[PDB]
Design a binder for this molecule. Structure first.
Ligand SMILES: [Mg+2]
Ligand SMILES: [Mg+2]
Ligand SMILES: [Mg+2]
Ligand SMILES: [Mg+2]
Ligand SMILES: [Mg+2]
Ligand SMILES: [Mg+2]
Ligand SMILES: [Mg+2]
Ligand SMILES: [Mg+2]
Ligand SMILES: [Mg+2]
Ligand SMILES: [Mg+2]
Ligand SMILES: [Mg+2]
Ligand SMILES: [Mg+2]
Ligand SMILES: [Mg+2]
Ligand SMILES: [Mg+2]
Ligand SMILES: [Mg+2]
Ligand SMILES: [Mg+2]
Lengths: 203, 147, 210, 102
RNA sequence: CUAACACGUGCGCGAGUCGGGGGCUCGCACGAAAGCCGCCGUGGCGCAAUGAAGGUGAAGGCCGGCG
RNA sequence: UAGCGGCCCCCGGCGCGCCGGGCCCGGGUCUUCCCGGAGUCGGGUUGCUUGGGAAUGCAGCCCAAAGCGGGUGGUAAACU
RNA sequence: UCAGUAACGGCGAGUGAACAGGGAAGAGCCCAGCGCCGAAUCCCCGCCCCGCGGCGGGGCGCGGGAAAUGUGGCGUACGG
């Protein structure tokens, strides 16, 4: 099918064809506003892969996030304390810009549920992501057995609780010797389990 | 019980068994193991030599299970099997020797320390020592290796 | 400050440990609740085994325990296929199945096949419809004697094989086991360097000949 | 003489027969399929090459092989990936030269 | 008051010892107690030390057979 | 209060039957085809974090893939 | 339980996991892609019949729309 060709194309981002396209789009997206609803996915294949389906109730929002790192919000310097905490303007945020974009989209559209997101373009000062949202109260998804999980109350604000694919990457979740910090639910859970006294009844 | 403790006998003595000249202050010498090299050096050197410094190689992902190797000695070697086994071997006349498997009982290496009673034995193990081997050979018997 | 003589100690109470303390005053209540849930499920599944599905024979994966035998997670597909059990039907008729486990050897595979065949011979299967039985089913008379069994089904045992007392021959009395171990260690350690030395000696001989 | 199984040595380990079996289908991933090769070569033909790839191709054409390897390693990463990329670029150059000659 | 350690004392068993976790006991006034498990001793401490490590790993004394 | 004590009302769960609707479904052998997630992995650097120590994990920036490939095999590197 | 251990630390003060083992519980699955089926798919308005206090089922509409920039059935690494 055509998707496989498309995918192998998009993997060739340094080719002149894709480079020209990316340039033109990025110009268009920068000309547009910071957050707006796109009529249809720019990457139909990627939306397919992440879980989008071309049916009523699936909406797509294109959003831009300012690039760079995170400088410490302190008055001038004045991060009062020991010198180890004197850093201001070389620190890095713990979550990725993709996660930031998803959380912004979810906050703006509080009546929808965030499914996934993908990268569509970038420049020196901006990064552009298209994020899939689902209207949980549309019959077209409430009557479909295999997608009605998202309509459950448990799945509110997955991007805010770090449950999407992009958000999960920052939590250090994994299996094996590389991810001992999060044995259990997460870092919080592992730290709790390791830092309590099990004062038994008999001792 | 609080009945039998020194505090009950100490009521009425202002001082509470801690002196008048030098009181019971909070932390006169520093908390924990402070001053190990400066003002507790004499005690540390007199009672815990070798405390400070480094020695040996670092082994990062140590797994004790690889090095697991319990040992048994020849004086205990006959206790692995029942007494009836040993007495039957003793009064047997065909020359047959009982087989003792230390791996079955949970030992991997046989070390030869004790005296061995004079009767043939077929000791099968995973590792042997030279002296244990020569003890078994001298008493008459066989050494069998298993994996 | 150190006293006269004693051990250097490192108590790990330099954090706010008193806020995170797990008292166990609910231990008997927890045991009672777990019991009640256990009996409730046992009553819920009326004739089925209380413990659950049968499980397989496995060897512990370590030098420390490889002599022992556990109860595994589930039977693997090779064993099911060679025992003639469908992977989907095994779960619904009471056989634990996992697809992750491989089978490097044949003794373990044959042992688990024997276990599955014994389980098939032993289980009593109720009619899919209580009125009319089917071909792959158990007859009516032995249904009256179907009861729950406690504990794991066909429990795992570590059985040790005796061989009788043997007579010594001179063949095994000349075996230098300690020497054999030492030369085995030496050969294992020096195998590669000996191969490299042989290789360079061979190429030097070839060069000299040419 | 006597050959007892041992915990140490070249043939260390408890003896047991090892049964052959068909490899798991999961191990098949990455194997190149004819249709996938067709698709990838079509996409390469329509797209072209990356600027670093064509610079490395120029280096190979002028036959500075060590320079090409070093540049590709710097541009891409690991030495294994560098070697594979250099081999594929040399194959592409050979194919182009053969086509030009014939 | 809790935890750790040291030593002294009392009791049980003893080259062993210890169910603390779990389970079985018609759950339930006391009883959230008590009893039992033994193919639930996994495991801890002890029974072997030494070396940085590869590793090694704990008596011998007399007569006949070629001082 | 004790009691497998009594009476009345309401709700549920489990079985049985009836009507209507959907469903036409499986296993073995042989032959032929097909099979995968990209500004992602990975590399450099910077900052934080971790018992993780020539960099455990996370993130910013720059570079940026492959298909007998890729990841892991707790000391950096090449070959196997 | 491993274990205050491997390890980190002006290697000072201090910090510090994991595998295996025994238990409590125990349950497995689904897409995209690759392909085959006349889009075989879904939402909504009108009328008729059922009960409707968790707005559903059946039929009739040359009723409207979504959707080929891809809905549904088969199918997912345990191969199909
Ligand atoms: Mg942080
Ligand atoms: Mg990553
Ligand atoms: Mg006085
Ligand atoms: Mg004083
Ligand atoms: Mg004074
Ligand atoms: Mg004091
Ligand atoms: Mg004092
Ligand atoms: Mg003292
Ligand atoms: Mg730190
Ligand atoms: Mg190494
Ligand atoms: Mg200990
Ligand atoms: Mg110092
Ligand atoms: Mg810390
Ligand atoms: Mg474990
Ligand atoms: Mg259990
Ligand atoms: Mg499809």
């Amino acid at each position: 099918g055509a998707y496989k060709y498309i995918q192998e194309l998009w993997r060739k981002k340094q080719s002149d064809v894709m480079r020209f396209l990316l340039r033109v789009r990025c110009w268009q997206y920068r000309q547009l506003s910071a957050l707006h609803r796109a009529p249809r996915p720019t990457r139909p294949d990627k939306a397919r892969r992440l879980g989008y389906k071309a049916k009523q109730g699936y909406v797509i929002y294109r959003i831009r996030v300012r690039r760079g790192g995170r400088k410490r919000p302190v008055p001038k310097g004045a991060t009062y304390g020991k010198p180890v905490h004197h850093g201001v303007n070389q620190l890095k945020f713990a979550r990725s810009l993709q996660s930031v974009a998803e959380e912004r989209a979810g906050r703006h559209c509080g009546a929808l549920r965030v499914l996934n997101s993908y990268w569509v373009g970038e420049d020196s000062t901006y990064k552009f992501f298209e994020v899939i949202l689902i209207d949980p109260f549309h019959k077209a998804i409430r009557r479909n057995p295999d997608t009605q999980w998202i309509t459950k109350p448990v799945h509110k604000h997955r991007e805010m609780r770090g449950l999407t694919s992009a958000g999960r990457k920052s939590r250090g979740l994994g299996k094996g010797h590389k991810f001992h910090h999060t044995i259990g639910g997460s870092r919080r859970a592992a730290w709790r389990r390791r830092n309590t006294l099990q004062l038994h009844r008999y001792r | 019980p609080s009945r039998l403790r020194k505090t009950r006998k100490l009521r009425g003595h202002v001082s509470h068994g801690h002196g008048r000249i030098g009181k019971h202050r909070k932390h006169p010498g520093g908390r924990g193991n402070a001053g190990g090299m400066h003002h507790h050096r004499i005690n540390f050197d007199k009672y815990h030599p070798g405390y400070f410094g480094k020695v040996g190689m670092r082994h990062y992902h140590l797994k004790r299970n690889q090095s697991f190797c319990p040992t048994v000695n020849l004086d205990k070697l006959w206790t692995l099997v029942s007494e009836q086994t040993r007495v039957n071997a003793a009064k047997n006349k065909t020359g047959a020797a009982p087989i003792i498997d230390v791996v079955r009982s949970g030992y991997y290496k046989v070390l030869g320390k004790g005296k061995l009673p004079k009767q043939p034995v077929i000791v099968k193990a995973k590792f042997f020592s030279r002296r244990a081997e020569e003890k078994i050979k001298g008493v008459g018997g066989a050494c069998v290796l298993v994996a | 400050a150190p006293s006269r003589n004693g051990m250097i100690l490192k108590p790990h109470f330099h954090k706010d440990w008193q806020r995170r303390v797990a008292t166990w005053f609910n231990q008997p209540a927890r045991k009672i609740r777990r019991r009640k849930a256990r009996q409730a499920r046992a009553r819920r599944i009326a004739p089925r085994p209380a413990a659950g599905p049968i499980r397989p024979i496995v060897r512990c994966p370590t030098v420390r325990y490889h002599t022992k035998v556990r109860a595994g997670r589930g039977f693997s597909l090779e064993e099911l296929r060679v025992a003639g059990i469908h992977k989907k039907v095994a779960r619904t008729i009471g056989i634990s199945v996992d697809p992750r486990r491989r089978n490097k050897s044949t003794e373990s595979l044959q042992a688990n096949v024997q276990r599955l065949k014994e389980y098939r011979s032993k289980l009593v299967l109720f009619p899919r419809k209580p009125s009319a039985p089917k071909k792959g089913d158990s007859s009516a008379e032995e249904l009256k004697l179907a009861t729950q069994l406690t504990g794991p089904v066909m429990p795992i045992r570590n059985v040790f094989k005796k061989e009788k007392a043997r007579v010594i021959t001179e063949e095994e009395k000349n075996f230098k086991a300690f020497a054999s171990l030492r030369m085995a260690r030496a050969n294992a350690r020096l195998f590669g360097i000996r191969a490299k030395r042989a290789k360079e000696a061979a190429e030097q001989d070839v060069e000299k000949k040419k | 003489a006597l050959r007892y199984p041992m915990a140490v040595g070249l043939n260390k380990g408890h003896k047991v027969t090892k049964n052959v079996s068909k490899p798991r289908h999961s191990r098949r991933r990455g194997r190149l399929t004819k249709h996938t090769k067709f698709v990838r070569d079509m996409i390469r033909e329509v797209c072209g090459f990356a600027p670093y790839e064509r610079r490395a191709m120029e280096l190979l054409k002028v036959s500075k092989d060590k320079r090409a390897l070093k540049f590709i390693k710097k541009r891409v990463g690991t030495h294994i990936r560098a070697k594979r990329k250099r081999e594929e670029l040399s194959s592409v150059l050979a194919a182009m030269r053969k086509a030009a000659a014939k």
